[PDB]
Amino acid sequence: SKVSVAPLHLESAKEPPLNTYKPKEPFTATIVSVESLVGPKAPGETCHIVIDHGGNVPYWEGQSYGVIPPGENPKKPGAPQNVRLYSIASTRYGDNFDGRTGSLCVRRAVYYDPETGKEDPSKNGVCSNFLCNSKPGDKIQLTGPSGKIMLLPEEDPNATHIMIATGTGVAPFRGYLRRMFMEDVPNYRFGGLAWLFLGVANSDSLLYDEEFTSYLKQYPDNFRYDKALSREQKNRSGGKMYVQDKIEEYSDEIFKLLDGGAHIYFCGLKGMMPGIQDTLKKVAERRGESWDQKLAQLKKNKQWHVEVF
Ligand SMILES: Cc1cc2nc3c(=O)[nH]c(=O)nc-3n(C[C@H](O)[C@H](O)[C@H](O)COP(=O)(O)OP(=O)(O)OC[C@H]3O[C@@H](n4cnc5c(N)ncnc54)[C@H](O)[C@@H]3O)c2cc1C
Ligand SMILES: [Mg+2]
């Protein structure tokens, strides 16, 4: 059954915390654990980082943490590095169910010369490698939390939530789904439909797959889960199987859910959105609908939630 979480006073706040810590005086947090989430055929490493904030930097599901990597700002010499934002991949209780830790899902940004493949440490992404290189006991400068675009609408505990992720965009949805299904939160008993779509490069690039697959067995009447593996599957038209091609497999069901008030969420690299928009336009057209009109209605009704980067 559901996992006991503490302390339940984390449910009492009426508003999400924002900018509790700021870049000029960050909170010095401590790494608990760092682990790769992916197998050897993945094109890059994505790691799972557990951070002990001691209860000093609480957050709501869907928010972001800021991390200030070490070193001087290369463009304001003598200045600290700029904040990098990461979608929190944990619930407000965290992976230890105690309200003291939060987790990040971090893709290593690694530079390869386009012609030769050669590497260059001055060109790798600073914060992402800093995080995935971290070890238990390392200190991390933490800011935030910040963001409200991806807060979970909880007014209707029987709402429908359609979650569209690529890569590390799965992060907010890991938090949503633990709150909906895994944790014992007496004031939020989810009885709607949660539907996760995840696009990644191949089977070895899947993120948290065992957790999501378990929800199919635990909550078969409230959870659905579909994956698109681009390098390893192909779409109806011969293209690489992308998350939008999976949406298209369920186009009638999805459009009916949207018309019924479902929330729909998008998270991941911003390059995911043009193909999704193209697919939704073609789906609408086949149904004899205007996607522009439909998207405007969804935004007007506060059903459309996008955090891409
Ligand atoms: C709201 C929000 C949420 C986010 N959520 C996440 C998340 O959950 N997970 C996640 O992994 N990321 C996330 N991001 C992205 C994250 O904030 C960083 O932008 C990303 O991790 C890269 O930061 P970095 O410090 O590693 O790279 P930077 O040091 O900022 O470098 C940026 C890029 O430039 C490249 N580069 C550097 N120098 C050169 C050069 N000379 N020539 C060519 N290329 C070069 C690097 O390789 C890198 O790809 C999020 C961003 C936003 C805005
Ligand atoms: Mg795997």
Q: How far is the CA of 197 from the centre of ligand 1 (A)?
A: 24
Distance CA 105, CA 65 (A): 11
Domain boundaries of the chain, sorted by first residue = 8-146, 147-308
141 close to 28: Cβ distance less than 8 angstroms: yes
Distance CA 158, CA 188 (A): 10
Distance CA 159, CA 188 (A): 12
Q: Does any ligand 1 atom lie closer than 6 A to the CB of residue 166?
A: no
Q: Where do runs of H (alpha helix) occur along the chain?
A: 126-132, 171-177, 209-218, 243-249, 251-259, 273-286, 291-300
Technique used = X-ray
- Residue 27 makes CB contacts below 8 A (sequence gap 6+) with 20, 21, 53, 56, 57, 141, 142, 143
Q: Measure Cα distances from 222 to 52, 190, 215 in Å.
A: 32, 9, 9
Identity at 29, one-letter amino acid code? A
CATH fold match for the domains 8-146 and 147-308? no
Q: Does any ligand 1 atom lie closer than 6 A to the CB of residue 283?
A: no
- Among 165, 127, 122, 126, CA closest to 143: 127
Any binding-site annotation on 236? no
Residue nearest to atom 20 of ligand 1 (CA): 128
User: Which fold is adopted by the domain 8-146?
Assistant: Elongation Factor Tu (Ef-tu); domain 3 (2.40.30)
Candidates 3.40.50.80, 3.10.20.600, 2.30.30.30, 3.40.190.80; correct CATH number of 147-308?
3.40.50.80
In the block, which residue shows the tokens 């991949």? 89
